Amino acid sequence: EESFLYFAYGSNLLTERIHLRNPSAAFFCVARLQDFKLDFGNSQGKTSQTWHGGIATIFQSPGDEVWGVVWKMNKSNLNSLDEQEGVKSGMYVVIEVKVATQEGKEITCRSYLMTNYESAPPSPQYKKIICMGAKENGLPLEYQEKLKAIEPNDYTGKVSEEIEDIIKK
Q: What is the DSSP string of the chain?
A: --EEEEEE-SGGGSHHHHHHH-TT-EEEEEEEEEEEEEEEEEETTPPPTTTSS-EEEEEEEEEEEEEEEEEEEEGGGHHHHHHHTTTTTTS-EEEEEEEE-TT--EEEEEEEE-SSEEE-PPPHHHHHHHHHHHHHTT--HHHHHHHHTPPP----S---HHHHHHHH-
For residue 11, count other CB atoms closer than 10 A to its CB.
Answer: 24
Domains of the chain: 1-169 (3.10.490.10)
Catalytically annotated residue among 1, 16, 65, 85:
85
Residues 79 and 128: their CA atoms lie apart, in Å, by: 28
- As to burial, measured by CB atoms within 10 angstroms (0-12 exposed, 13-18 middle, 19+ buried), residue 51 is buried
- As to burial, measured by CB atoms within 10 angstroms (0-12 exposed, 13-18 middle, 19+ buried), residue 41 is buried
Handedness of CA 8, 11, 13, 17 (dihedral sign): negative
Is 117 annotated as ligand-binding? no
Burial 117-154 (b: 16+ CB within 10 A, else e): beebbbbbbbbbbbbbbbeebebeeebbebbeeeebbe
Q: What angle do CA 142, 136, 79 make, to 5 degrees?
A: 105
For residue 93, count other CB atoms closer than 10 A to its CB.
Answer: 14
Is 54 annotated as ligand-binding? no
Among this protein's residues, is 85 annotated catalytic? yes
Asked whether the beta carbons of 54 and 119 are under 8 A apart, the reply is yes
Residues 97 and 6: their CA atoms lie apart, in Å, by: 10
Is 9 annotated as ligand-binding? yes
For residue 99, count other CB atoms closer than 10 A to its CB.
Answer: 25
Angle (deg, nearest 10), helices 141-148 and 124-136? 170
Bridge partners, 58 (sequence order): 38
Is 41 annotated as ligand-binding? no
Residues 8 and 69: their CA atoms lie apart, in Å, by: 5
Is 112 annotated as ligand-binding? no
Q: Measuring CA to CA, which residue among 56, 62, 10 is closest to residue 36?
A: 62
